[PDB]
Every structure is written in structure tokens, then in C-alpha cells.
């Protein structure tokens, strides 16, 4: 499946989690920003790689990145 | 079944086999349905439409031609 990482540059806006069509990310407690939360990629097996998450990050540089990797049925978005 | 017939024709011609082409002089694909209609509009005036003196179009005329100047206006 694809590879998705998060960085301490994250501000806890939570927008990507809202942007994801396959429920890959989620927010977890943290203490590196005023929001006190940070994104996480606990289910990268369900990711498709549409990068809607990245398209929704306001950090100067994306704090969530998606590195397209090995292709699986799940990632190829196949209903057959 | 349209374009592939052309490529067939190109290859046969280039190989010097005109008789193996889709043409009027070889393997004919005569569009008979459009031809029959064409003929029907020819026999239309007087027969089907008695009020019509001449044909609807000269493309259905058969043996009628119209010229203006030295140039051809229309014909079957």
C-alpha cells in the first residue's frame, strides 16, 4: 500500500482528516501546538493516494505527505 | 468494419492484389439500401406523388441534368 507520514510541523487544524475519502488519518493528543493535537496514519492500507489531504494542509510545507508505493487492490480503487 | 476495410485495401493494393480489395471491380460492398431508396424517390413523382411533376432532388433524377453557363448545377 501507499506510505503516508505526518510531521511536527502540524498545527492540528484537522482538515486532512476531514478531506480523506477512505478514513486513513485521525487526530491524536499532542503538546507541540496550541491545538494540542496531531494527525496520524494508522490505516495506510486503505489509502488510495488522491492526496485530498495534502490539498487541504495549510502548513507552509505540507505536514502530511503521501508517498505512493506498492499497489494493492485497495489502493487501485477497484470495485472489481 | 469501416477503417479496417481501408487498411485492408491499402495493403492489398501495395502488394499488387487489386482483386483482393474492397472495391466495385473486386469484392463489392454495394450500399443497396440507400440505392433502393434513391430509386424510390426517382419513381416518386406521378406514381407515389401524382401532384409532383418532377423529382424532389436531381440526385434522385436518374436521367435528368441541369446546367447554368458551362457548369453543372446538379445531377444524379
Amino acid at each position: 500500500s501507499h506510505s503516508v507520514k505526518i510531521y511536527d510541523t502540524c498545527i492540528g487544524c484537522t482538515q486532512c482528516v476531514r478531506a480523506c475519502p477512505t478514513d486513513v488519518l485521525e487526530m491524536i493528543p499532542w503538546g507541540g501546538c496550541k491545538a494540542k493535537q496531531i494527525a496520524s496514519a494508522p490505516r495506510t492500507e486503505d489509502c488510495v493516494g488522491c492526496k485530498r489531504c495534502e490539498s487541504a494542509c495549510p502548513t507552509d510545507f505540507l505536514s502530511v505527505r503521501v508517498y505512493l508505493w506498492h499497489e494493492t487492490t485497495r489502493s487501485m480503487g477497484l470495485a472489481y | 468494419h469501416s477503417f479496417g476495410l481501408y487498411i485492408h485495401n491499402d495493403t492489398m493494393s501495395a502488394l499488387g492484389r487489386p482483386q483482393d480489395m474492397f472495391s466495385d471491380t473486386a469484392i463489392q460492398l454495394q450500399p443497396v439500401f440507400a440505392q433502393w431508396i434513391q430509386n424510390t424517390h426517382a419513381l416518386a413523382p406521378g406514381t407515389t406523388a401524382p401532384g409532383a411533376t418532377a423529382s424532389t432532388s436531381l440526385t434522385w433524377g436518374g436521367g435528368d441534368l441541369v446546367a447554368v453557363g458551362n457548369k453543372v448545377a446538379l445531377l444524379p
Binding site: 495534502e54 505512493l68 477497484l78 | 491499402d10 492489398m12 499488387g16 492484389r17
Partner: protein, 732 residues
């Protein structure tokens, strides 16, 4: 592993048809393979290298075999001017009776293809005379091709595999490639010339049976070791000399006459034996510069470390640059390809102007074919050189280890490099097109006197310096009171001045305003293609739009629609862009070459000189004009021997346009289409008894651009080749 491709587990677990596609396009990218080590990397390449040589030896072996078995050659040797060389025989059951008649040419017994590679003139010049000679040559290469495979297999065995440090022994390899691979090879080639080639051009046949009790020279090696080498140039072949015969034959084996042999219109054999002998010296002595195991020589590293201009205007100069190149195979391939690409063009530009093979200049189709051949090879090689350059920056470039050296400073001021290349391209583009269009309007309004026809006097001045009488100018070698002239006076100059001022040959052809414009087109083509490629290389590791373009590799589809949209942002993709421009550039080059030459051979340089200044002229008087015999290869009335070129001509157009589909329409459309077909198959009775083992999916984003580009390129090459050969050979 588990299944193909088992050099990559992650790609074998692909349940779609993509696993097969990508399994083929990554088979040679050894570094991306599973469990790869630096040891296995150098060993796989080394082995592949033997495999490549084996194929090359085998390939040439095929040509020799077929020319001997299905070609005249012997008939061609007697009448070079009036015999068409045969490529091989044609056996095609699809052939109609006419096609068999129309194609049986060259005095063959059946339908044959006419060779346009020029191996006939090459082998005749080389010394080969009969078919027996060709067969034993074919045997020899078949043998060499076997020992290539044998050696490739040998060094894949554990007790014969070379260590990585052996591959990184640069100074030893250079000392041997310069001295042995270049020098000794060239030295021994001049040996073949004075033993076989030169005496063969003088009627005497020297093969293995009698090359021992037969002297290449009357004084026979005496004067060489004596020091009076001048004796070998004492009696050259006459001006009335006939090739292959004793009529006018001399005794000399090493001369410097310059110019051409009158009969063959090619360089003197005694000029070329001398050439390679002289070459072999600078190479033999040259391959003793670097250090090995004898306590003498140079440390390449230490030289680079020492070349730092004080006042640090180049920073730390070339320090650490030795390891940067010796550790990165891509840097080496890039340097190799760039160098090779340049001398590939050098070959092209020299073999049409200074023919080295007997009776090759008279064969116009061969001359046109060979020139176009190499200029496209050179072009492709050049883009690859600028592809591994980027790959190097991504995979092997170490920023800290190249701190502030010339390589690093490139990236440091990359914006300046790119913007100026952009300016140069914009300047050339705006005016070359501008002048072409202005002239077209004048011709349209019927006022050719209003054209802008700039004389290329700079280049005309060069030709004068070479000794061309036209234009006047009174430059060096064009002036009686010139130190340069009187220095070379009656050595190579009488032969040179005679040849450069002959109106038949292609030795520094007369150029005018029409030549001025196309050259700027050429200049435009070069600058733009370089602009694309170096912008690709210098941005491979990142930009403002994608700061971390590394981490993603050389080839990736994109980075999504965010940040404005990032399609074709990878270094692989600007390669993809540059190939188009390089195809456009070489296209302009070969159009220029072929039009100038067909008008010359036709004795009508007027048509080129007056029509090449406006673009309608190119369309009408070059492309539309010379397409006549080609497109009539087959007709509603008949078929000709040019029918195959007519067929290929359309074939090229078809492949070319088919590629437009992959380049214009992109993936999401086709993916949604296929999944409706996936539905159909499962819901169709009798058909759903049969199930696919690989899931049908649309070609990937990058794969599309590759497939599209290949079609575009194949069409490009096959279309022009169909035109180049037919229009030429139809007229000759």
C-alpha cells in the same frame, strides 16, 4: 519473489495488469531491484556489457552472411557506378505477382531489398573482394559473439566476479583504454590498411595465405627503424589511378596528399593509414599519464584537489569531485553519453563532406540515409546524457561531500542558468520565426525584393579561411601572401584547395541567406532542448512548488492537484518534454541537409537558394515536390518498387497519430471505461466461464507518456525514413 517480476516483491503483489507492464520497464533498473547491493550492481552491468557486445558481433555477422549469400557484391566490385547493392532477399507469401516482379532488382534471381547503409563501399574500400572473404568474416564475428557470452557467464561465477574496488580503479582503466583500446587498436588498423587495403586497391590480393612472403613496401620496414620514414611517401598513386587496378598505382603506404582520389571521390587510402598510425602515438603515449603499480603516474584525485583558483571565485573548485564521479555510475554514463553524442554528430558532419569509402559519394540515397541515421542517434543519445545527469542529482549526489565545489555552485545559481537559456530561446524564436513570416508575406504580396535576406558572412569568412575562392575576402589560405598558406604549401594544401573548390563534392558547400535562417532555427532547437533538460536536472531535487522532489525519485506521476496543480513536474517528465523538441531539432537539421543535397545532385541549387528563405517554399518545393514518386508507390492503376516506402509512409503517420491518444487523453477516463467492461464480461453468458487472472486496469500516468512518446517517435522516424529513401532513390 513469488512471481514475475521477482526482482521486485512489491510489484509482484500487484493484482492488476500493471505488474506485467512495469515488470518489463524496470528489468534493467538494477538499483531499484530487491536486495540489491553495490557488488551485484557492478556485476550485473559488467555481464550485460558482454551480452551487448555479443549482440553487436552477432548483428554484423548477420549482415555479412546475408550480403554474401543473397547479395551481388562481386558484381558490384566490377561496376561500382552501375550496380545497386543488395540488402538481402525478400520471401513474403503475401506478395502478389506484381510485387515479386517489381522488386526483383540488382540482377538478383528473385525479389530483393536494396541496401542503403553503405556496407558495400565500406567493405570494398576495406579490402574485401569476394564472398569467401565475407563468409570467413561472418564466421569470425559469430565466434567473437560466442566468446562474449562465454566471458559474460564467466564473471558471474563466484570465483571470477570482480570486486567493486576493481571497477573503481579509474587510473588503471584509463591507462589501458587510451593506450590499448584506442592506441593499439588504431595502430593495428593502420596495419591492415598497408597490408591488405592499400595493396588491394592496387590489384594485388593479400589474404592470410600470402601476407608473410609478400612485402607491403619494396624497402620493406628498413626505413622505419632507420628514421628516414619519408621514403614511404616517395611514390604515391597517380592522379589517373584506377581503384582495384595497377593502372596508375604507386608504391607509397603513408602519405598526406589531402583531398580526394579522383575516381572514387573518397579520401586516399594512403592518407588514412598514415592517419591511424599518427593517432596511435598520441594515444599510446597518452595512456601512460595516470598511476598504477610502478611508482610513476598521476593521481586523478590529487589533480582535482589542486585546481582551485585563488580568490575563490569557483569556491572549492573540483575538490571531492573524484569520488562524486567514481561512486556514481549515472554521472559516468552522463559524461559518456554526452561525449558520445557529440562525436556521433561529428561523424555525421564529416562523412558527408569528407567521404572515406570508395564510390560512396555517388550513392546519394546512402549518403542521405547515413547522415539522417546518425543525427537522430546523436540526438537521442544527447537527451539520455541529460537524463542520467538528473538521476545522478537524485540518487547519488551527496551535498555535504560536494560542499561549495563547481558542481554545487550549479544548483546554487540554477535560476540564473535557466532564465538565460530561456532568454536565448525566446530571442532566437521571436526573430527566426519573425523573419520567416515576414518573407512569406512578401512572397504572398508578390514582392520578394522586400524580404529580409541576411548574408551569413561570418561563416562565409570561415570557408574563405579554409581556401574557398568564392566570396573573395582575401583571407588566410585564400590569400597568396599568407604565412599559413606558404607553411602548408605543397603538402596537404594542393589536394585540399582542389577539393574545397570542386563544385561537385559536399566539401564546404556555398551558403547564402537561406542557410542563415535555418541555422538559427537549429540554434533555436539546441537552446530550447538544453533549456528543458538542464531545468529538469537542476530542479530534480526540488523547487518552490515541490521543495522535496527528491524522496519521490526520478520518475513519479505528479504531486496531485493541490498547490495549483503539479502535472509533469518530475525530472523524468521534462525528459519526456525534451524528446519532442529534440525530434523537432533533428528534423530541422535533416530537412536542411536533404533539401540542400537533392537540389545539388539535381544541379539546381537555385531552387534551394530562392525557396529556403520562406516557409511556404519548404512545404511546396521540398515536401510537396519530392513526395510525388513516393505516394505513387501503389496506385489504382499499378504498384511500383517504391510501394513499400509508400506503405511505410502511412504506417509512420498512423503510429505518430496513435501516440496522440496517449498524450492528449489521460488516465481517469480510461479507468472508468474499463470498469464498465469488467462489468460486461462477468454478466455475459458463456463468456464468464472464462475469468482473467490479472485485473484489467488503465495504463498508469507515467506509462501513458512513455507509450505515447514511443508512438510519436516511431512514427516520426518511420515517416521521414520512408520519405528520405523514396524521394532520393526514386530519382537518385
Amino acid at each position: 519473489a513469488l512471481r514475475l517480476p521477482r526482482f521486485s516483491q512489491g510489484i509482484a503483489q500487484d493484482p492488476t495488469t500493471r505488474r506485467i507492464w512495469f515488470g518489463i520497464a524496470t528489468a534493467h533498473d538494477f538499483e531499484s531491484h530487491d536486495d540489491i547491493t553495490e557488488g551485484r550492481l557492478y556485476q550485473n552491468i559488467f555481464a550485460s556489457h558482454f551480452g551487448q557486445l555479443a549482440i553487436i558481433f552477432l548483428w554484423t555477422s548477420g549482415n555479412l552472411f546475408h550480403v554474401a549469400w543473397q547479395g551481388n557484391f562481386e558484381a558490384w566490385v566490377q561496376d561500382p557506378f552501375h550496380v545497386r547493392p543488395i540488402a538481402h532477399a525478400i520471401w513474403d507469401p503475401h506478395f502478389g505477382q506484381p510485387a515479386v516482379e517489381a522488386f526483383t532488382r540488382g540482377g538478383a534471381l528473385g525479389p530483393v531489398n536494396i541496401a542503403y547503409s553503405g556496407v558495400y563501399q565500406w567493405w570494398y574500400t576495406i579490402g574485401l573482394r569476394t564472398n569467401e572473404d565475407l563468409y570467413t568474416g561472418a564466421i569470425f564475428l559469430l565466434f567473437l559473439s560466442f566468446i562474449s557470452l562465454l566471458a559474460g557467464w564467466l564473471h558471474l561465477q563466484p570465483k571470477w566476479k570482480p570486486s567493486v574496488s576493481w571497477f573503481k580503479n579509474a587510473e588503471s582503466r584509463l591507462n589501458h583504454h587510451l593506450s590499448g583500446l584506442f592506441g593499439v587498436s588504431s595502430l593495428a588498423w593502420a596495419g591492415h590498411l598497408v597490408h591488405v587495403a592499400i595493396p588491394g586497391s592496387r590489384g594485388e590480393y593479400v589474404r592470410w595465405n600470402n601476407f608473410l612472403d609478400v612485402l607491403p613496401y619494396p624497402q620493406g620496414l628498413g626505413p622505419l627503424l632507420t628514421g628516414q620514414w619519408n621514403l614511404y611517401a616517395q611514390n604515391p598513386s597517380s592522379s589517373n589511378h584506377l581503384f582495384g587496378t595497377t593502372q596508375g598505382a604507386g608504391t607509397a603506404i603513408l602519405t598526406i596528399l589531402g583531398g580526394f582520389h579522383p575516381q572514387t571521390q573518397s579520401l586516399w587510402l594512403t592518407d588514412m593509414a598514415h592517419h591511424h598510425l599518427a593517432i596511435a602515438f598520441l594515444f599510446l603515449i597518452g595512456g601512460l599519464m595516470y598511476r598504477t603499480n610502478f611508482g610513476i603516474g598521476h593521481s586523478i584525485k590529487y589533480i582535482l584537489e589542486a585546481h582551485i583558483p585563488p580568490g575563490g571565485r569557483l569556491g572549492r573548485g573540483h575538490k571531492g569531485l573524484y569520488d562524486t564521479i567514481n561512486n556514481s555510475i549515472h554521472f559516468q554514463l552522463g559524461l559518456a553519453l554526452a561525449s558520445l553524442g557529440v562525436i556521433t554528430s561529428l561523424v555525421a558532419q564529416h562523412m558527408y563532406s569528407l567521404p572515406a569509402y570508395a564510390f560512396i559519394a555517388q550513392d546519394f540515397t546512402t549518403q542521405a540515409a547515413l547522415y539522417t541515421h546518425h543525427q537522430y542517434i546523436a540526438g537521442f543519445i544527447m537527451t539520455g546524457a541529460f537524463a542520467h545527469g538528473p538521476i545522478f542529482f537524485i540518487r547519488d549526489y551527496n551535498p555535504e561531500q560536494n560542499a561549495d565545489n563547481v558542481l554545487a555552485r550549479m544548483l546554487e545559481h540554477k535560476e540564473a542558468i535557466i532564465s538565460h537559456l530561456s532568454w536565448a530561446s525566446l530571442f532566437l524564436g521571436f526573430h527566426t520565426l519573425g523573419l520567416y513570416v515576414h518573407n512569406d508575406v512578401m512572397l504572398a504580396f508578390g514582392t520578394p525584393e522586400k524580404q529580409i535576406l541576411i548574408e551569413p558572412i561570418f561563416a562565409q569568412w570561415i570557408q574563405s579561411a579554409h581556401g574557398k575562392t568564392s566570396y573573395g575576402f582575401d583571407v588566410l589560405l585564400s590569400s597568396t601572401n599568407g604565412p599559413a598558406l606558404n607553411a602548408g604549401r605543397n603538402i596537404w594544401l594542393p589536394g585540399w584547395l582542389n577539393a574545397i573548390n570542386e563544385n561537385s563534392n559536399s566539401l564546404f558547400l556555398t551558403i547564402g541567406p537561406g542557410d542563415f535562417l535555418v541555422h538559427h532555427a537549429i540554434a533555436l532547437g539546441l537552446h530550447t532542448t538544453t533549456l528543458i533538460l538542464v531545468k529538469g536536472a537542476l530542479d530534480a531535487r526540488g523547487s518552490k512548488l515541490m521543495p522535496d522532489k527528491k524522496d519521490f525519485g526520478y520518475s513519479f506521476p505528479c504531486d496531485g492537484p493541490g498547490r495549483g496543480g503539479t502535472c509533469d513536474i518530475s525530472a523524468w517528465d521534462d525528459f519526456y518534454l525534451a524528446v519532442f523538441w529534440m525530434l523537432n531539432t533533428i528534423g530541422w537539421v535533416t530537412f536542411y541537409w536533404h533539401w540542400k543535397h537533392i537540389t545539388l545532385w539535381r544541379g539546381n541549387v537555385s531552387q534551394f537558394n530562392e525557396s529556403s528563405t520562406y516557409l511556404m517554399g519548404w512545404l511546396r518545393d521540398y515536401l510537396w515536390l519530392n513526395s510525388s514518386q513516393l505516394i505513387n508507390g501503389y496506385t489504382p492503376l499499378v504498384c511500383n518498387s517504391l510501394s513499400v516506402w509508400a506503405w511505410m509512409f502511412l504506417f509512420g503517420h498512423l503510429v505518430w497519430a496513435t501516440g496522440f491518444m496517449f498524450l492528449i487523453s489521460w488516465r481517469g477516463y480510461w479507468q472508468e471505461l474499463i470498469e464498465t467492461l469488467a462489468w460486461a464480461h462477468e454478466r455475459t453468458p458463456l463468456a464468464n466461464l472464462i475469468r482473467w487472472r490479472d485485473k484489467p486496469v488503465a495504463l498508469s500516468i507515467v506509462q501513458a507518456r512513455l507509450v505515447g512518446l514511443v508512438h510519436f517517435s516511431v512514427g516520426y522516424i518511420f515517416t521521414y525514413a520512408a520519405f528520405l529513401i523514396a524521394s532520393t532513390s526514386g530519382k537518385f
